[PDB]
């Protein structure tokens, strides 16, 4: 009955794991050699990453 | 694409070990899977 006002907090724990961002067109795993990995725009020329 | 020598030489992309191995060693490894595992050594390519 005498409960005080409340404010919610949300967080998550995920250990023993690595965040993964697969270099693929649609993020799926269709093989070791990703389709985007062998795509011409990336196989032919050179690039820089930030 | 269709030509990148380093990949085909290192089995990154190309034929599988069931094919590029000389087809006498394939026979041997296929015969002795039970007691002397051999298929774990070589590598096979997977291409999306």
């Amino acid at each position: 009955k005498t409960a005080v006002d409340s404010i919610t907090q949300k967080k998550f724990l995920c250990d023993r794991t690595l965040w993964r961002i697969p270099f693929s067109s649609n993020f799926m795993s269709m093989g070791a050699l990703t389709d985007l990995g062998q795509n011409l725009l990336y196989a032919n020329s050179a690039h820089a990453l930030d | 694409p269709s030509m990148m020598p380093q990949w085909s030489y290192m089995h990154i992309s190309g034929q599988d070990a069931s094919e590029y191995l000389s087809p006498g060693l394939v026979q041997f490894a296929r015969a002795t899977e039970t007691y002397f595992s051999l298929n774990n050594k070589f590598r096979n390519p997977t291409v999306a």
């Binding site: - | 190309g14 599988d16 999306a48």
Partner: peptide, 25 residues
């Protein structure tokens, strides 16, 4: 014979469906 397949080599890689409440599995 589409070849959009994921490929495990030179070789590329049934429609099925069905499980009612009771039926074996």
């Amino acid at each position: 014979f589409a070849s959009l397949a994921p490929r495990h080599g030179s070789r590329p890689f049934q429609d099925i469906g069905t499980s009612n409440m009771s039926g074996g599995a």
